[PDB]
Structure formats: structure tokens, C-alpha cells
């Protein structure tokens, strides 16, 4: 019994939303055109060591209103992405809600296992033959993070690309460092990595690399470790390309923050049936391009195998590891938030049973070889907050306001038309912020924002949906960030913090990028309707639209003419009730002030908004109230005219205007 | 014919719950974070010997709420579970009733002796087949317990460096001990250790060892010794690591107090084919750590093979071993009231006919390979002691007062219908205070707990349950502790002299522990919701249900608001519905303080209690019963919000939330 | 539901397949006529060493056509069917799937050796049933191989005869070689066999010759060795040729490479009523041909007995031993795929137990009388690998390509419909080459392969399938070679370096070798027509086929004619049929060249391809697809004759041609 429900239901069932595969395949291959930081301009060569936690890839994307009937032409105006692909930050928690984490079935490595262990074992310790007691959990996901974080190294050295190199293998070590210094990479003031040069474990009698190591022969014994064990045939062990991968994931492995690190243990340790091939411990050079490339191939075909050839969360937990340092930069001033609330992976400390002796599958183009995976793990993110940022403004702009002296009972007051009763909670501002979680949740669960959240991520990822969505709530129950009286002025990676201010002390949290990439992408997009083609424009509806409890980005018909001519086009006057009595009539703005409006005047100095061309903040809520207007014409015709607006962006994905939506028509 | 019963049991059958191996699996590699002393903090650096006996291994775990639709900021509270570390007691009792101790089946161990014996032309007297039926049984259970308190003095010399140790034997053979000195590993008052170096038997003409060694000769007569009998094949009698194993024992068996070594004398007799390899006692520093796990694994393997290849009757004999050192502490104020009365083991003296000659099944992952044998033993008591707690809160929370009028009224005086009329129990304070046994013997005997607590276990262990059930019976049934009216102040672990009494002298004896731990680890819970997620609180009827005696943990509104609200979101006046007089309406407390409500004000002038976030304590019974009360609301509707609760417990299971309940 | 597989089957059941045992009988007399080096000729003397790794015995088969009603001489074509001859690999691997190797029962053999312990009087410890299945399981795997492995060595060094010999043992132990000197037989480049003289383990008290001893006393202890125990009468250990045929086994066991000597002792112990004979290691020439005779004849007699009486799996397993020399060489350009994939046998170390007293079957025709045991395991194999092509080319010839844009757009991009749409496979190159593996794994387990390839190696072996069709999957399941895109040339063995890249870079993974000689073998043949005898040809639906993406092989008058015609019988002409807009008729070869066909012209100025007479590549996809082709002939109606095809190879066999196909 919700007529806005069903129709959103049966239009999205019209128009299927494109799965993620056609993102993929546009992004996959296309080098940036330019890396700059984000306020100011590069210099002449790059510094020894990136250190400036603001450079950012930007993509440019314009868009160009043409009309005839105004004074002057319309300047155009530049939406562009921007990508943070510098600073750090964790992704990685331990809370948990029933589909947040699944254990994997070892189904198909216990039998080789057990075959493998009933034979090559001294014929005195008794036959196993019960297949019974190899049980501990599966949970092979740390080791994809981690090969994740260890891909975003490789990207980042890569795209800026610093005065004096050192190979990949050799800045990730880190031999010619200082005795506390910061690695090659990664050394800035918010740098979170294990300083000084990495130091290679022990030289015990059993050792296969960086991990442990037990044989199974008769002249021995055997006692299964604690933690993981991978079980692999003798010729695997004792080959190169593999000790270099071990090495690798132990090294990247050692940078992370010493208390992370001591929470979730590098536990992996493998069993065979030769001779242990002492550790290694590459240094100075002896690791390489080439060499590190192939380490990686054979990596990611033992992780594949290890996940049961799933490849579609083994994508997932990569992108999430690599998410750690490329993330999309938000577009507005508010703050960049709604990206803060959804970063976290449900984790535990990696266990289970594995066995690997062949490939299983091959994989057309995995994620480590995409030049340059750190821009399509950050745009796949995007494409999925954007997603959550349609669903949320399903209703209203959803504002959260400051007021002195509110009751500390309750923070539910009724703004006015264009936001519904449940949003728009006021707080005061003299003590500490909320916590920005009493909201979400709360937003997130009705069965409205819900069942549309539910269908719109399972036709972009389709089998493997619950996995993500599971994810993001629980993101979502346990986020500290908080609500802050500042700004991020569009050119920085966080806030200054100096004394931004709010202009209406309030804070819109629904809004994250302009919904122009979710249409141009194909993704659901709300609200907003599109801008890109010839439009019929009614201003002396448009405008009565407008008044009562609008948003200027629906009205393109206005933005077009704001300082273009539209004084002299329409007046408004009070009322002209030929009745009753004749009151005045006034409307509320964003703030407390109800200024009113008495006799017929041009309308350019009875709102007099500001003028960004035709891109204005589309969940602004520029007028609450109004009542007792009329918006007399004075000028025949001149007010249903034609315009056309043209974007182009160079992210137009296949099916880019053919995604579902539900603006008004 | 009961109904309520009949729908337990029916949910129950419905949703299965959870078998014992996870719980074990999900505890063989926990790390622990926290040794701190259970009040106090750790000392910069830890001292030479075991002397404080208040060291606990802290499983932290946290909770935090928050008010959908608020700006208010609850601060996160602390699930507390502490694992006694350093404190000695007794879990040893030689009383059985019928199913307690079971005689493991020698069927197949007679056979082959006898094939060995017929080979190698020994004189025997009379078929062995009655000869061990009558003149020695086969009851191993005591070399198990051994073992397993060996692995606990391990664990806990393990945890605790004593900032120059020296080896699990050196600090267990007391080389270099004065005569009246202690052990380094138990220095304390009121242990439980003989003290002094222990001294190795004089060195008599065949010896295998600490104990005494036959062998079999080709046409020589052969008369079996009054213990028991190890035969073995001679291989390894010479072997190092099982004389290793055997000494360890017989160390561990002569540092147990010097009173239970006249009752559970370690009698051996190893039998073979060999020349005896005589006693070679270690004296100085010659058992490595190597050595020592080679012992280990050699003794469990022995071990192993003497249970019939059982490997759950020899773990659980094992792990009670071990709570002899590693104890689960209570999470209330008059605590150690469950945990004392189910430890007990019944149990016989050792004895009977063995045979090893190579080991048959190879065990993965035995006890003593954990990370910590003291923690995996330690919670495995505490889901037995969990689910007692389940069914013993079944029909209420089961009070006991002191209440000097008690000979002049009978019960149910003050106890309103909060608690169930039949589970509230008073004695006068000028007898001493009672026995525990004879409260809890008549909880356990009802038909109705009974039928429940043993579907519970069967499903929880399975084939082996009913030796658990009867051995936690025969405990419960045979139980010294007295309900003391004291506190324990919940920041110790033994009762500190002066403490001051318990509130309103009524001990609650059902309570052991949080039930949020039962639900995480899927184990069967209480009539307790679980606070796991979203909430839709309504606090008037909420609030409504509290004063019919309901517990406040199953309110969440109230909880959550505590100190946020409630002195301008609902008022409490009196009824005034019919036409007849007026009437003051009036509540009762637990200690029977009738409380008038004569003029109308807000909630938390008229009532009040301590805030703990969400977790209060779930059975304190707060109020017993009121009449002629009325609740409105002075907020223009914000009093029906919704909650969010977060419990990320470090020791979830599988199973998160399936298990069974009352209350769903 | 199928309806092409139940065909299939139906015609498998109407036709049997030909039984293993004619194959085995029409070669144990083949006398080899070729032993030149595969890519060139051979030398006037032969070397003193074999190094060259490129000899083959080549087995020539001659092919030649004939166009009845003509005058033209089409030059006589030649099937090469290639041995290789000097080349070691590995077929040994430690991986075994359920059914892939077997434990014989030792049913017959406990009872005799309990029976011999209890009349000599020896005091055993334990009934010997128990100790047997868990201390000692059956395996004698290994002790077969090491017997191939020397047979193989022996015909090896017979067939290229080194211009000075010396005896199949002064070539095997190594008398007079310096310290880095390879031996004889074996001396090149990647070659895998030990270097230097092998050394002799020192004489300790009791020895057998090579292995430990072990004699049984009449009441005195008896105690088993770990590894395996051969009970032996006394008559024998004191022969000659038993001891010469255990030194020669323990000769070829120290020579392979190091590795594998420390995962596969050979290990053996001898046990008798004798006095220790003691090793007497031959050390100058003294082991001439006839005791080797001798003592091969002995060591097949003891082996036999150790399988229980089997000798199928002790003749699958001594030929399993061979591959590791002689291997069938591939007849295509990118070749090393099939056979590559199966070799492989799951294996367990030596140990269990065994009794020998007497031979009991008379084998009348074992391996190692065969006129040359290398020929004879080859072929088996070959055999094998042409059942393996046949199942897998039954939907299509399964290409694998090498496109740059191979992201971007999704499988079946380029292959028309003659690849069959979900057989086509593509990798961009800038990734190294896949591993096969990943290829074939899929393809074997698809149930219509399965089901198929299942009856196929029933009907050919029997009983004994299941081991061959377990090993084979495991085998193929478990593979490290890489589809690798350079080429072979067809005129060498190993791969040379610097070779060219392949033809559209598209690998063919079906193809090993023609299916004619399965025809010829009378097994089960792929979907291709057997060129045997007289043919009616219509070369105008013929070729109409072809340009649907049939096979060319499968045109008999197009190879007949493709350069003696064709250029003045059939011309190419667009269709004209409707009134539509005329379009350019054109066709795609195989790396997605789309070939315009505007203006009508002769066929060989539109297509081409080289003429091999009538053995063309079969599987060489040659068009994709083709569309708006319009074939007329302008020969006044002589295009439709008759061709004549002999086929006289030397490895025919009973069943000619009367197994099963797919389009007879």
C-alpha cells in the first residue's frame, strides 16, 4: 500500500540497470590524462618521496547550456571527478552480522588431503581414515587483502612517478632505510605504515620462505600447526616464482599498524612432502619487474584455487584491500561523508585447509593486470555509493540543522514541505556533534529505502549480491565519523582545520556527487531528472513549483535565465483573492528569516539566488515555505521557450541514458 | 499436560543446538590480550614466583547502543569475562551414584596379553579371562586426571614468566628447594601442594622406573603384581621419551597434597620382554623442552590407547583435570554459587590389565596442542555451567532471604508474583546460613527441569552426555558450600575478610553469568532476549510490563534512557478510573519497603537504579509487585524510537543466534 | 536426452571395440627398420656415447591415391609415425584421486608366513593380521618400476648399438667413471639420471646382497624391519640370479636423480632360515648376458608372485616404468600436449609384507621377452592417447587463440560456427600462456565425454579399466605444462630455440596424431571417414561442405585434385538468386580475415592450401564461415569420378576396420 513503491518497482523491472561488467569494461583501460594536487598546480619534477597527501587523478567533464532569447551566452561550467589515490586510511573490522562474513566449504581439499596424509605419514602414529577431524574453519580472506594492499603499492609508486625510482621489491623492503624513517612510499603527516627497514623473521631448522614448515616422512612426525595450512605437492615448493609470492605477502604484510598487526596474525605456514628449501631473504636486488610480475600470477592462481574458483569475492576482498589508498574525493562543500559510513569489511583471522596442485579455471583479465587497478577499484566503489546515495533521497533531501537551546528529549522538527516528517532532525551546536549513525540506520531500514536497495544491487551484481549489501549495513551499524561545522572548499582531501563555516550552519547528509555521473554511468539515480538534449520550459509553472518546497536543479528553467534577463520577465505579487480579505504572503528561506513580500515587484530582488550556470546543488532546500503568491507574466510569451544542454564526459559508459529513475516528469 | 514445558521442547527439537566441536574448534587458536590481575594492574616487571592468587586471563568483549533519532551518546559498556589463573581447589570425590563412573570394557585387551603370554611360553595360573574380572577391574580414569593437571601447571607456569624461569620440570621436581619451601609455580596462601623437592623411591633390584617392572620368562612362573598391569612390547620400554612421560607423572602424583596420596595411590607395573632398564632418575637439568613435548606426545598417545581408542571420555577426564587450576570466575556480586556446586568427578582407584603395542588411531588435534590447553578447558566448564543456569531459570528467579520474622509467617511473604510462589526460601539470621545442597538438590530433581536439562546436553554432547549428566548431578548432589550472606564486591576472586552484606540480604542462586554469552556461542538461554540488533521499543507498555515483576533486561527503552530521559518523556500517576475512593497506589520493593505514589511526578523522582548502559543485571528483581499505577507520556509523541545494539563478542561461534529460547 | 551421444553409444555397443590383447600380440614380433636421427641421418659409425637427444625409430606406413578415368600420378604420401628414443622424463607423482591406486590384498599371503613362523618356533609378538593392516599396509608399487625402468635402460642401449658396448651392467654400475662423468647409456644435455659410480652401502653383520637381513631362530625373538619383509625358502636366497636380479634392481634405483632417492627409499629386508649369505657386490666384469637373462627371468617370477598372480597391473605398471624412455612423438606443428598430460602414475612408498615360495603361473609371453620391450610399451600408450583424442575432437576441434583485444569483446568473437560455440577459448598475449590444465580438466568432465570415454576403456581393457581411467584423470587433473605459443616444426624432438611463432597463433589441444592409424588399430576413431578404399567423390556438395566449417580432410576430391584440377572443373560465382540488393559473397579463415569474393574466378585464385596428396592436417580449420557462395563446374560433366586409396601399414592388426566411429 505505497503507490510510489510500486512504481518505482515496476519501472526498475522495465528498465534492468546495467551490471557492473560494462563498468569494467570501460574503465579497464585508459590511462589518466593528467595527476595533479588538488589545490594548486604541480611541480616542476616530483619529490623523492610522495608526501603531500592531496595528489588526485581528475577526470574533466563540462557541460553547456545554448539557448536564444537571453542578453548574454551562459560561461560553461566544469564537473570533474576526482580520485584521492594518496592518503591512507583502515578498512578492516572485526564486528559482524549474519551475511557479513561466510566461511567458505572445504568440500573438494579435504579429500586429497587425507589421501595425502594417510600414506606419506611413519606407520606409527595410526591410521587417520576418519576424514572426520579435519574441520577448522575456512576463512581464506586476510590473504587477499593483503594482495590487494600489495597491488595498490605497485599502483601508486606507478602513477606518480617519483625524481629518483628504486624497484618495487626494493622500496617495499626497504633495505637502504633509517633506523625509525618512513618507507619510500607512504611518508606524509597521516601515514600509517611499520617505519624502518623490514627484518626478516628467524633461521629455525624447517623454513619455506617467510612462514613455517612440517614434512610428513617416516623417519619424522607430524603435528598440524595452529593456523593455516597449504597443502602443495613437492614440485610447487621447491620452484621460484612461488617462494617470491610468499616473500611479497609476508613483506606487505609487516607494514601495516603495529596494533593491526598484532590482531590478526600472518599465520599461513605450508606442508609438503621433501625437503624444506631454506628462506630466501631476498635483498639489495635480487628481486625485479619481471620477477615480481610472474610472483604475482602465481599468487593469484593460488588464491583463486584457495577460494573454491569463485572469483567474484575473491574480486571483491582485492578491491576492498585496495581501497585503502584509492577512494573517490566528494564534490561538495558539506564534507565528503557518506563515503566514511560504508569503507569497512567484516574480517577474521585467516584459517582453514587448503590444498593446490593445479589451476581449475582461468580468468580472462583479473584485476592485478588492468593498468593501473587503483582507478577501477575507486570507481567501483563509486559506482556503489552513488547507488546508496539514489536510495537514500528517495524521499527528501534529509537536512540536519543547528539551533541553539533544542531539547535534548527529542530532535524531530517539521521543516516544512519538500522534507518529509521523519527527516530534517535539528541539534544544538554547543556541545559535541552526533555521532551521524542515529541516522543512517534509521534511514536504512524502512521498507521503502530497503526492497529498492535490494533490486537495484542485485541486478548491477546479480548472484553475488547479499555479500555486498550484508557488508555495507553492518558499515553503516558501527561508523564513528561524526557531523562537523566546517568545509572542505572543494579543494582539499579534508577538511582545513581552521574555521570553515556553514552558510546555513546546517548540513545536507544525503548528497555525495552530482547525480549527472548516475545517469551518464546507468546506475539508478533519483530526484534530480537528466540534462542532456533539447527541454520544454515553463517558467510561470516552473517557478510556482519551485516555491512550494522544490529544488532549483529540477528547474532548469530558471538557472538558465537567473541573471540572464528573468527581472524583467515575470512579477510576483501577494494575492489577488477577490473575496475574503486581502493578507499579504511571505516565504521562509534555508534559515529562520520570513522577510515578506507586499506589492508587485520584479522578482530579481525578492530572492536574488546565486548564479553557478545550470549545476546548482540539487538537495539545497533554497526555499522551505510560501504561501499567498501568483507570478504574474509581463510579457507575452518569453516564458515558453526551448533550451539545450550538452555533456560530455569521458566516462559515457555503453548503456549510458537507458537506467531507471523516478524524477518527476 | 504442562503447556509451557511441551513448547519448550518443541522449539527446541525444532532448532537444534549447537554441537560442543564448534565451541572447541573456535577456541584452539585464541590469543589472549589481557594478564592483568583481576583488581589491580600489572607490576612493571612480573615477579620470580606464583604468589598473588588473583591473576585472571581477561576475554575482553564490548557493547555499545545508540538512540535512532538522537543526539545523545551512550558510552560503550564491558562484557567482563575473567578466567581464574592462579588459585588451587578440588575437583576430586570418591561418592557415585549409578551412572556416574563407567568400567571401560577390556574385550579387547585380554586377548591379546594372553596370545603374548601363550608366546613366549610363560607359566600362567588360571584363564585370565575371570581372573581380571574379579581380581582387577579396569578402571583408568586416574592416570587421565594426572595428565591433565600436568598440562595445566604448563599452561599456567607458561602464562605467567615469572621473569627467569627454568623448565616445566625444573620448577616441577623442586631441585633446589628448601625443605619447607614451596614449588615455584603454587606459592600462595591456602594452596594445594606438598612442598619440598619429592623424593624418588629407593632403587630396588627391577625397575621400569617410578614404578615397579615384571618381566616374562620363557618356562619361569609369572604372578601379576595388585595394580595395574602395562604390557608393552619391548621396543619401547628403552625408549627415552616414555621413562620421560612416566616420571612426569609420577612427579605430578607426589606434589598433590600429602592427604590424597594415601587414598589415590599411583600403582603401576610395566610388563614386558626386556631386561629391566632400572630407575634413572633425572637430577640435574636434563629434560629440554623438546624432550619434554616428546614425553608429552608419547603420554597422550599411551593414554589414548589404555581409553579403548574413546578420545571423548579421555578429553573430558582431561579437562577435569585441569579446573583443578584454570576456573570460569561469575560475573555478579554473590558469585561462586554454580561453579562450586558442578566440579566434582567421581571416581576409583586405578587398576586393571592394559596392552599397548603400537598406536592405532592418530588423534589431530589433541588437548594439549592448543594454544592454550588452560582456556579451551576452561570453557567447555562454562557452557556446562551456562546451560545449568538455562534450566534452572526457568520458572523464575529462585531468591533466598534472611528475614529475622522467619519462623512467624511462611513463605511467599514478601515475595510478590515476581517471583514464581514456590521458588522463594527464607531462614532467620541467628542459625548459621544454610546449605546450597539442599536448595539445589530440589531445583534438580522437578520433572520438569529434568526432562529439559537432559535433552539439552544430549544434543549438546550426544552419545557421551549421559556420564556429563550424571556426574553434574552426583556434583550438584554432593556439594559442602554455604550460602554466606557476604559480598564479593565483583573486583576479587576469593571473599575478602570485611566485605559488606549482600542487598537487602537476599541471594539470588541462579545466576553465574551473563546470558549474551550463552547466545553468541548458540548454547541453549534463558527466558532473556538477546540484545543483538534492531529494537522498536514502546516504553508505556514496556514500562507497564516492568511493574508486573518482569526483569528490567527485558527492557530496552527503560535501559537505554536511563539517565537521557525519562524525567520529561513519561509521568506516573495514580488511577483514578472508577467512581470508589480514591486510592494511593503503591509499589514494592525487593526487601518488602512498601512505596507509596500519592501525587503524580516524574519517573525518575519515584524510582531509580544504577546505570549500565544496556547490561543490567538480568535477574535482580527489582520490583516484586504494584497496584493501582498509571503511566502517561509528556512528549509530543518521541517516545516510541528505535534502538541499535552492537555485541562484538571475540568468542562468537558459528551458530551466532540459532539456538533455542523461551522468549523469542 | 541427448540424441547424438545415444547414437553414439548405440553404435559403440552394436560395434565392440578391439580387445587390448590383439594390439599386444601383433607386436611382440616387430622388427624396427629405421633408426635414424629424427631430423637428419645417420652417421657412418656410431658414437661411443649416446648423446645426440633426437634418435627415433621410425615405423614407416606408406599411403599413395590413385584418380580412376584419368592420367594423372599423385606422388605417394607418408604416414611418420615417430618413437622417441633418447629422452628422460618424469611420470611419477605423489597425488592420487579415489580410485587412482589400489592396495592388493594380502589375503594369500599372512596365512603361509604365520604358518612358517609357527613351525620354525620363532616367539612373535601380536597376532600377525592386526600388525599387518596397520603397522605395514600392501603396496609394491614401486618395486614394477624400477623393473620397467631397466628393461627400458636395457633395449635402449641394445637398439643404438655405441660402437664399443660393454653389457647392460657395465653400463649400469658405472665401473670406470670419473666423478662428474655420466653414465653411459645416458650422457646429455637436461639428461636425468645420477652421475659417477654408485657407491655400495657399507657391509654391516647381516646382509642379502643390497638389503638388509633378517633370520628367523627357533626360540629366540623376532622382530620386523620398517620397511618391506620377503619371506623366502632357503633354497633360494642362497641362488645366484636371485642375488644378481636384487643387486641389478638396487643398481637402478641409486642411478635415478637425487631428489627422488630421499621420497622413495628402496627399502627391503629378506627374511629366511639362512645363514646371512652377505653381499657380494660385483665389481668387475662378472654379470654376463645369460646371468642377466637369468636373473631378469628370477625377478619377473618373484614380482608376479608379489601381485597376488595379477600380471595385468604388474604389466600396466612395468610399461608405466618404461615411458620414462620411450615415448610416441606427435604428427602436428604445436604437438606435446596429449601425451604431455598423460603420463603421470599415483604412487605410495614401498612397504607391507610378502612370502615366496614357488612360482604358481607360467606366464608364457612377459614383457621383457618381447622383441623389443620399447616398441611394445610405446604403443600401449599410444593406444591410449588415441582414445583420449578421439573422446575429446566429439564436439568440435576446440581452439585456443591469441587475441590482443581479447578483454574487450566475449568468446565465439571469431569462431564461426565450425567451431562449435562454447569450444573456442582466447588470452590476450601480454599475460603468459595459460596452463593446459585449466583447458582440459573442464573438457574431460563434461558428462557426454565421460560417459563415452568410460565405455571406451571398458571395451578395450576390462576389468582393469577402472585403475587406467582413475590414473589418466588424475593425470590430465594434474599437469604444469603451458600452452606455449611458439612452434615445433615436426622435424626435431625437443623444442628449439628461436623456433616461429604458430600459424593465426591459434593452438589446436586436440590433435596428437591421425586418426588413421586409429582406424587401423581398430579403435575408437573421431568423427573422421577412414580413406581405405574406393571413394565416389561429387566435388560440388563436397566443397558446398566445406565452407560450412567441415573438415577438409573429410573431402576426399579436393585433396584428390587441389593441384591437378580445380582450376578448370569449378569456378566461384557469387549468388544472384533474388531481387535483392547483390552482395559480395565472402568467407573468414580462421585468424578472422574476411576474404571478399566480388567477380566470379577460378577456386584456385580464390582459396589455397598445401597439397599433402590426401593426408591433410584433419583438424587444421581451415574456413570458419562463409556467406552468398555460389559453386558451378565448367568440365563437361567429368567432375564427379572416382579415386582409389591404399593404405598398407605395418601395424594392422585383426580388426582392420571394424571398430566404431562417428560418420561412417
Redesign the interface.
Known amino acids: 500500500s505505497n503507490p510510489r513503491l510500486t512504481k518505482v518497482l515496476d519501472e526498475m523491472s522495465k528498465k534492468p540497470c546495467v551490471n557492473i561488467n560494462e563498468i569494467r ?1 570501460m574503465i ?2 585508459f590511462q589518466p590524462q593528467f595527476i595533479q594536487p588538488r589545490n594548486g598546480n604541480r611541480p616542476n619534477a616530483q619529490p623523492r618521496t610522495v608526501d603531500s597527501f592531496e595528489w588526485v587523478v581528475r577526470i574533466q567533464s563540462t557541460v553547456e547550456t545554448q539557448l536564444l532569447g537571453a542578453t548574454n551566452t551562459v560561461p560553461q561550467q566544469t564537473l570533474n571527478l576526482d580520485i584521492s589515490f594518496t592518503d591512507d586510511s583502515t578498512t578492516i573490522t ?5 551475511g557479513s562474513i561466510s ?1 567458505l566449504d572445504n568440500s573438494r581439499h579435504i ?2 588431503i587425507q ?2 596424509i594417510q ?3 611413519a ?6 581414515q ?1 576424514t572426520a ?5 575456512q576463512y581464506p580472506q586476510l590473504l587477499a587483502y593483503l594482495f590487494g594492499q600489495l597491488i595498490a603499492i605497485k599502483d601508486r609508486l606507478d602513477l606518480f612517478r617519483p625524481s629518483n625510482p628504486l624497484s618495487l621489491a626494493d622500496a617495499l623492503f626497504g633495505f637502504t632505510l633509517a633506523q625509525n624513517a618512513r618507507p619510500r612510499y607512504d611518508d606524509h603527516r597521516h601515514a600509517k605504515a611499520c617505519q624502518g627497514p623490514l627484518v626478516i623473521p628467524a633461521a629455525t631448522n624447517s623454513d619455506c620462505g617467510p612462514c613455517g614448515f612440517v614434512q610428513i616422512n ?1 623417519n619424522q ?1 607430524l ?2 600447526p ?2 593455516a595450512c597449504l597443502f602443495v ?3 610447487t615448493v621447491n620452484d621460484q616464482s612461488f617462494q617470491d609470492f610468499l616473500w611479497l605477502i609476508f613483506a606487505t604484510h609487516h607494514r601495516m599498524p603495529n596494533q593491526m598487526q598484532n590482531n590478526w ?1 600472518f ?1 599461513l605456514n605450508i606442508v609438503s ?3 624444506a628449501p631454506g628462506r630466501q631473504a631476498p635483498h639489495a636486488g635480487e628481486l625485479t619487474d619481471e620477477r615480481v610480475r ?1 610472483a604475482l ?1 602465481t599468487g593469484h592462481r593460488i588464491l583463486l584455487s584457495m577460494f573454491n574458483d569463485d572469483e567474484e569475492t575473491l574480486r571483491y576482498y582485492q578491491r576492498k584491500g585496495i581501497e585503502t589508498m584509492f577512494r573517490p574525493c566528494c564534490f561538495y562543500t558539506e564534507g565528503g561523508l557518506l563515503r566514511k559510513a560504508t569503507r569497512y569489511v567484516s574480517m577474521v ?1 585467516l ?1 582453514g585447509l587448503y590444498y593446490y ?6 580468468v ?2 583479473p584485476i592485478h ?1 588492468d593498468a593501473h587497478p587503483g582507478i577501477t577499484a575507486a570507481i567501483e566503489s563509486f559506482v556503489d555509493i552513488m547507488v546508496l546515495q539514489a536510495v537514500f533521497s528517495f524521499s527528501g533531501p534529509k537536512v540536519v540543522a543547528a539551533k541553539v537551546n ?1 531539547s ?5 522538527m517539521v521543516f516544512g514541505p519538500a522534507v518529509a516528517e521523519g527527516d530534517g ?1 535539528v ?2 551546536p554547543l ?5 551521524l ?3 543512517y ?2 534511514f536504512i ?1 524502512r521498507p521503502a529505502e530497503q526492497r529498492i536497495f535490494q533490486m537495484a544491487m542485485s541486478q548491477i551484481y546479480g548472484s553475488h549480491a547479499p555479500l555486498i549489501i550484508a557488508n555495507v549495513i553492518n558499515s553503516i ?2 561508523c564513528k565519523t561524526k557531523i562537523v561545522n566546517n568545509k572542505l572548499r572543494a579543494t582539499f582531501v579534508r577538511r582545513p582545520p581552521g574555521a570553515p563555516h556553514l552558510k546555513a550552519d546546517t548540513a545536507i547528509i544525503n548528497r555525495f556527487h552530482d547525480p549527472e555521473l548516475a545517469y551518464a554511468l546507468g546506475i539508478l539515480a533519483d530526484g534530480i531528472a537528466p540534462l542532456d538534449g533539447s527541454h520544454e520550459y515553463n517558467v510561470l509553472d516552473e517557478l510556482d513549483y519551485l516555491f512550494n518546497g522544490g529544488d532549483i536543479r529540477n528547474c532548469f528553467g530558471l538557472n538558465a535565465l537567473n541573471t540572464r534577463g528573468l527581472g524583467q520577465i515575470v512579477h510576483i505579487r501577494p494575492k489577488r483573492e477577490p473575496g475574503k480579505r486581502p493578507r499579504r504572503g511571505f516565504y521562509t528561506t534555508l534559515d529562520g528569516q520570513v522577510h515578506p513580500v507586499t506589492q508587485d515587484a520584479p522578482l530579481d530582488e525578492i530572492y536574488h539566488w546565486r548564479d553557478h550556470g545550470n549545476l546548482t546543488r540539487p538537495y539545497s532546500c533554497h526555499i522551505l515555505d510560501s504561501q499567498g503568491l501568483e507570478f504574474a507574466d509581463v510579457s507575452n510569451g518569453r516564458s515558453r521557450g526551448k533550451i539545450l544542454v550538452v555533456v560530455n564526459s569521458p566516462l559515457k559508459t555503453c548503456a549510458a541514458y537507458q537506467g531507471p529513475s523516478f524524477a518527476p516528469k
Open positions: 569494461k579497464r583501460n572485526p564486528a559482524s552480522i549474519p566461511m579429500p586429497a589421501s595425502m600414506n606419506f605419514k606407520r606409527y602414529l595410526g591410521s587417520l576418519d577431524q579435519l574441520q577448522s574453519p617416516a612426525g603435528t598440524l595452529l593456523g605437492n613437492p614440485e596474525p599465520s612432502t621433501c625437503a610472474l600470477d583471522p584459517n596442485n593445479g589451476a581449475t579455471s582461468y580472462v583479465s593486470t533544542a535534548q528529549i527529542d530532535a524531530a532532525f541539534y544544538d556541545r559535541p556533534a552526533p555521532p549513525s542515529a541516522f540506520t534509521e531500514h551499524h558501527n
